[PDB]
Design an enzyme around this catalytic site. Sequence first.
Site, PDB file in Angstrom:
ATOM      1  N   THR A 133       0.837  -1.190   0.000  1.00  0.00           N
ATOM      2  CA  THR A 133       0.000   0.000   0.000  1.00  0.00           C
ATOM      3  C   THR A 133       0.872   1.241   0.000  1.00  0.00           C
ATOM      4  O   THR A 133       1.753   1.378   0.840  1.00  0.00           O
ATOM      5  CB  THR A 133      -0.932   0.024   1.211  1.00  0.00           C
ATOM      6  OG1 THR A 133      -1.748  -1.152   1.203  1.00  0.00           O
ATOM      7  CG2 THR A 133      -1.826   1.242   1.165  1.00  0.00           C
ATOM      8  N   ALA A 182      -8.937  -1.219   5.584  1.00  0.00           N
ATOM      9  CA  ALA A 182      -9.660  -0.992   4.340  1.00  0.00           C
ATOM     10  C   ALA A 182     -11.114  -0.633   4.594  1.00  0.00           C
ATOM     11  O   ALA A 182     -11.661   0.247   3.924  1.00  0.00           O
ATOM     12  CB  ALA A 182      -9.573  -2.228   3.450  1.00  0.00           C
TER      13      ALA A 182
END
Lengths: 239, 228, 204, 238, 201, 240, 213, 215, 250
Positions: E1, E49
């Site tokens: 990420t 998330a």
Amino acid sequence: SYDRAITVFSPDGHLFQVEYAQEAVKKGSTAVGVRGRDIVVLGVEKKSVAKLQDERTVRKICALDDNVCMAFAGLTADARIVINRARVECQSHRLTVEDPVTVEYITRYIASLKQRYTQSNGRRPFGISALIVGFDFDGTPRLYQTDPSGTYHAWKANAIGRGAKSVREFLEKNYTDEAIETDDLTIKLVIKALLEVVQSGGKNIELAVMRRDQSLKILNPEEIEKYVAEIEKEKEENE
Amino acid sequence: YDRGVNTFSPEGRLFQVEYAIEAIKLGSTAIGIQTSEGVCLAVEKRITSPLMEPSSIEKIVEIDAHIGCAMSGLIADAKTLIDKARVETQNHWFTYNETMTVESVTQAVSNLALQFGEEDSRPFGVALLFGGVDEKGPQLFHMDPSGTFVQCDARAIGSASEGAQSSLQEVYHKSMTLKEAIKSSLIILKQVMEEKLNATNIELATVQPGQNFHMFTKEELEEVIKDI
Amino acid sequence: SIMSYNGGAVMAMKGKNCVAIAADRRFGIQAQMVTTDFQKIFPMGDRLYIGLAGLATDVQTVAQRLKFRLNLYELKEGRQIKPYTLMSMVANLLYEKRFGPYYTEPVIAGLDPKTFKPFICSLDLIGCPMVTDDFVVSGTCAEQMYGMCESLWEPNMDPDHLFETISQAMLNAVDRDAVSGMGVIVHIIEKDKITTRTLKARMD
Amino acid sequence: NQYDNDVTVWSPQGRIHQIEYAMEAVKQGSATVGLKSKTHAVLVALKRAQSELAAHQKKILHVDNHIGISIAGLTADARLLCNFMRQECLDSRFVFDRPLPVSRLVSLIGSKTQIPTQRYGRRPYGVGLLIAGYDDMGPHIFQTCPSANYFDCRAMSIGARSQSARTYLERHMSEFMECNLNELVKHGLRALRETLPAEQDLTTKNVSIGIVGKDLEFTIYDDDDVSPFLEGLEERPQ
Amino acid sequence: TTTLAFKFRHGVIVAADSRATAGAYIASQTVKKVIEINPYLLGTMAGGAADCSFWERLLARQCRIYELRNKERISVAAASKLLANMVYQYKGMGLSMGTMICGWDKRGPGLYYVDSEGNRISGATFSVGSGSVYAYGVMDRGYSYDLEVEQAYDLARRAIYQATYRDAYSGGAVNLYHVREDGWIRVSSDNVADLHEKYSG
Amino acid sequence: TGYDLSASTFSPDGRVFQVEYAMKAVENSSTAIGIRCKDGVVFGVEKLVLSKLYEEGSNKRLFNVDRHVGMAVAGLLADARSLADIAREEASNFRSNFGYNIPLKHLADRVAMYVHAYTLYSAVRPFGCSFMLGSYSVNDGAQLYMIDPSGVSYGYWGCAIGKARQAAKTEIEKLQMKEMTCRDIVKEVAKIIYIVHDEVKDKAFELELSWVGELTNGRHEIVPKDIREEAEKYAKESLK
Amino acid sequence: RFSPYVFNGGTILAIAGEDFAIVASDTRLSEGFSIHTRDSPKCYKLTDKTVIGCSGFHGDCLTLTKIIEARLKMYKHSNNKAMTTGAIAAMLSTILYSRRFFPYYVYNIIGGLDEEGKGAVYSFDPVGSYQRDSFKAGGSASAMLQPLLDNQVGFKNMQNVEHVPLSLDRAMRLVKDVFISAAERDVYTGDALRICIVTKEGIREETVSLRKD
Amino acid sequence: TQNPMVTGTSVLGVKFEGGVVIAADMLGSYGSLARFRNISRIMRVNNSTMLGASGDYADFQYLKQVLGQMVIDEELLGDGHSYSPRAIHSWLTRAMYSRRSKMNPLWNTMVIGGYADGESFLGYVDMLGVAYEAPSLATGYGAYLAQPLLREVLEKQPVLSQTEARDLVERCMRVLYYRDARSYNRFQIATVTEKGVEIEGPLSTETNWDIAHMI
Amino acid sequence: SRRYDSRTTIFSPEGRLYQVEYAMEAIGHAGTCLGILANDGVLLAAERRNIHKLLDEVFFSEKIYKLNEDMACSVAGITSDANVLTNELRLIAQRYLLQYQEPIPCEQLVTALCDIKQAYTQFGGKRPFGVSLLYIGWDKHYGFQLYQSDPSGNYGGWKATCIGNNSAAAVSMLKQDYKEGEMTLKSALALAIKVLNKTMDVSKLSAEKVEIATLTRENGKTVIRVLKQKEVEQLIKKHEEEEAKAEREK
């Protein structure tokens, strides 16, 4: 808990305890507010002091913030608690959204605090009316009023309290565009109206202006002595 | 002598619900017209003083981007119902990722309208029109202080309500256009108000299928007036 | 431990018609002093003091809760508080936090106001009062102070020899402690006047 | 009349007047007629409006797949018991995974509405629920009243001018337990033309029909699908 | 990420990858980590998330109610402050959230950084993620306040490509937005396997 | 006046009228009688057919509280089945806490204290119902109690509540309930409620009977059809 | 002590087509080393255009299905219409987050039709994050199915391969073959393959057997 | 229940043509101690359903109390309605799941047999809230021992008569007597049909010990 | 239950409200208190009412209540309602000192109590207090201060005010004999004995009939001294010596 509806409807469609509260406003001392393009002018009339006693504790023009002034009329017991509840919400607004409180936002908090208080149980409504005067961001001077039922409402000039419609009829024939030309010219616009009210012979009047960058500034009874000297002198040579 | 707030009449209706029906006969008049091209929706302001700022008051206010409103009777307690409607349309968007329909906004408000009492204190003294364009096209609803709502096609609410409805039943037909429905409403408001008609005593708003809720302002509004 | 986080030592000692109290001056965090003028003895009316030692939070916390309850007492009643009465008041305050306890050990010393008779007591951190006739001690360096007082105390002592005994009891014991020091203040009270002295101790 | 103010106060004759005034509220709403066969339960309502351009107020509501109701009175208390009605059906379906029986539903309503008829400063619910549904025992027609007294019946009619509809149902109820869905409905439709003035009857925009059926989920028919049912009626004899 | 954001003369540039993993197993390659709060605000996704997806959709609800009451749009500094207060009431309960808030304001561009621990800082350049330290070095080299628009695109586009090359938890495609005066404008979304042929030659 | 509005005020001669006004509402409900035999209790309720449109088996004025306890009510029917819900719920707390079936001297004690509790305050009204409780046990025999809206309970060999109360219990003491079993009682229960309610007041009416005892093996249930047809066969022989 | 969770196996699979949607699952419920039953499918028909699949802890799977089906009726009684496919996936993301600090141990895939009559597949985590995809596998053998569909459906890593849209006939035999290989290698993969097909007509069903180890 | 004190053991159950048969033994163990040797682990719910249980026996008497009251109050309504076996199975599933969520479970495992409306019902209910249906069920070590004997008959022969089903249970109860340390040679067989619910007396198994002479 | 409710909160149709005006009607009778300051020091002159020959004369004061360590109050009206207010703002000053570790300013102690007093006039369906009371005290911001409370909830700063039975006659004479900043704490004492010579109808000024307490600022003390009954009567006759001198010579 005392649970009882105080304000109920009438057989013709009115609220008794609201229109009774508006009579209590109509015997408080007169507060007059106008607005200019850079400086606002507001000042209560009929100070009615004992003139041998204290005077710094009897003031009816206070500050909610650095940019918001607020005058009122009606019974003063219910008035200084609405101010102290307004000084908290405007202070808790800064902990939220970063700007200083706009003059439109603080009127909605007071008017909504007053409407839900004509709704609840065991509560007589407030017996005050107020003028919220401020100069917000980008320098736009404007004022408002507040009815005891909670209807905030902007203006270009206002006058509440005892002897209001006698001033309110006088202001509309007196409000011109060129009366808001200078700063001290608009102060004489207030001084003629309060002289057209309960007595206000210079010692019973108390004005306070705001130059959109300052705090509230009360002139002592020397400029009001000077202004009522020259407002009466202009009337003595015109007529 | 003094009843409670929650008492039936010998004719059976209530007392203070029926008294609040009388209270909206003192408010300013308002007209909404449903047309298949879109919903037009107008009001007067009832300006009291020349010293008064005219635009500080409003009667048309938006609930969402596709739903407008119009209030009558009292004003100060109308703002409580408007805030409950705005929150309700955002909870429906948050949980369902769509737009709440115009009818389902109204029953979300109408359930709130009759909940007073002595536990947990009077009915609301307003009357509302809800104009919106959901997926069934343009809609027009009208609620009550009693909480009773029904879809209308051309509803006129205010102090001149029954005088306007009679003059509105004769000109409405099911195949109007929006350009003539706007003109037909200001003919009615020209009769019923006290002062003369100009660009400051009234204001309008129309919602369309194409664009969102649009409120007219004092520049595009007077071309309707000069071409009345 | 918890009591060893800031150090401290309070001693009280009874004399003939007079009573003296003493404490150290150091404020610090486990190795590191911050200042040498931290107040640990607090006045509660004339001829009646209290000493506090333990965690530095609860020293300033109890000394303000107690003054909150003391002024309400001396206005609701028209008189000053007896030294035996304050012992029951402080013990009530600490036992309310039976499971949330304050980490301090108070020492109370003063004269009875009508009949000028000395009074000393000490309390644990949950309020068990213990009155004695010779001395009470509290703080981290407790055991060093017992060897001083058991070896030096005499029963009937004028305020001159009372001062010299409690001074040598504090200077020799606190020097043997590591987390206590940086000066010793001594209050010695009596029925006519009161005396505050500071001693010349090791700043080491 | 000082005995005429609160629900708590008994009359010296022994009749609480606030309950009797809520019976006047259900007599103000428009009429509706429910009836049942051996295998079906049909209720027919008659709408009203305010102006000719306003829409007609609906009365038949959908509670569950096998229970539907029809209201009469003020509409706000109707939705208050309706949202109680839907809630008590789907949690029994959540717990026991079965349709909640009709005769056991109505006894929950009778305990619900009896509570504000005994406290202080609490109005009764002015409402006119006609209930049609399915147990495992076939169709059921139930009516309620604001006195919290529910009735088991086989054909009833409530609302404004409903006594004329009851006289029609008494002299034809020997035929009801035999016929199919077609003339079961227009037996009930001949009751609604009885309760009207002699000039307007059934103009396909003020009438609604709801049927639950032995293999048929509860279905509401509104103002276009009424027209197959509504054709096949004779003219009013004069 | 790996997400990044920097402001310059012509607005704010936001870029991110699209790989979301589950342990060593890659769940998806097409995860949009730059979610669209408004037509005038943007928010990134880093850490949780679903924690970043919920509390920023809850923020978009709150900013809409502000506009309907006050009849103007919320500032960027006020919007970040509302988000930092809602997250703080669940401190210690284990929320993972490291987002950024972008948008044009009445004071010009706006760029803020909100953690789940309660950090709220402004600044000029930021980079959040597991491969964020791989993004700082290539971004600190080619950064200027006076960059051109086509040069600011190719800076932030290659900077994600250098982070996905070293990090094992970063990859997918390179999304790229541009916050402007009126609102945000989506620029492109390029695959890394397409950029590898582009940047080699 | 003014002394009779609330249930919290006595009269100037010392009695409560709100309870007496609610006692008057019982004599507009029709008639419920119940006598106990040597080895069981038999209830009986005559049911007014108000209109033809109601269904045979509607709105029963004869409840079923526990497995062995029965209830026959008379009064405002909404308050009848509300008292039936707490009595049905009170017996459930006894079995759950103490293990066994509740006795009648305790059950009618707990219900009457619940009825008495609404004869004290201004916030609530008294109930408008009087009702009977009867059962049978193998260790205690048959029991029969009756509760007024004030909250007073007693035992009975036979009782009657409704419109014609004295006109019903005049003929009950003509019977001999000490020695008859609960079979010939069923014919005598029906007969004394055919002689009441002249056909001028009502056109037609409905018989509804109940039944408990060791012949029913302790469980409470309704009579079968054939037995109450024998009593309805024993109807029209009172014309001689 | 008493552990509140257990793993009950299961394997679900969805594919979004141009005018269809296919949701398949095995029919084995089992935990530990034993077999409870050989018939327990996961094809739950919500509407006539939406089918959900629920793998994970089976006690949460029975609860969550009954919570959702209550909330579709509460939608229709308040809005007089049925939920679309995108409205359900937005609703259930709030249901899963509502127990954030004691989560459901459920994997979810929603497959159905949108307003335009196209296929749509949404995939959930046990907390409530989602995205719209073309195909997702979930459950025990999800790591064995996702690489094979990247080759055939996604057309990845192939050179000079054309791009034909998925016909319904081609997708059915593609589903049937990929569960045969997953039954050979995973031990939780069951015995019958319950395939549900959502088209413009309705929901078709089909049962295809597997091996029974 | 954090720790079950007095526990039971495996409970068997299988469908047949027109009814369900369930058997379980009559022993309440305490660790490895056999204290209570005459208890009954099968509750006869009203007329068309039937319940046996494993696990903690004090929690079983709680559910024996709660389900007892739910049948008593419905039958005195006179509705003509009763709970189906899958209605009780759906209720009891919700009772388990709503109680582990409060981290305070009932330490049981329950088998619900029932014959309503011409067909047989056989339901499983777990402590964690896991429920399913099957033509044959087994708990405890019976899921390892007796459960393969149940399935190898039902796959070669899907329908069984009552005498075939009753013979097939007593074979499975015999095996659990040999290979389980918590078993006891005294059990009772319960059977629902269209006629009603019938529970048989304390039956016993016959054991074979011929291999003990093989050194 | 709504038949017995007396509605002590609502307005009247003329606009004012009746309940506190009945209380301020009762505040006229039953008591006399006054204060004065112009310089270093401030005093409270109060007149005792129950002068019966069988009382113990204890508790150091009768209508004077020490509130803080540097301020006190004199009360008038219902004495039982007074005891609840006096031990209510006694711990308002203490919870201030707990919070800031500083003595409370004299003005914002008055505003804190007059908000509690205002709330009963405004909601709750509750009887308001028929209590008005004075306030003397010292603070570092403004020095010696003098306030007055009303049962409506509104306060005010003053220099000399009486709430006696003939309080209008006292105020009319205080603004006949006064000097701004020059009345030392001996001329004010002679003026105090002059005023309650007038308003007390019981003549000759019994020294046990009045009470006088002074608040003088000693460096860290702020001595609140209730002067004893041995120095009242010499101050009484000092007023008596000058009035026979001034009458005869005029």
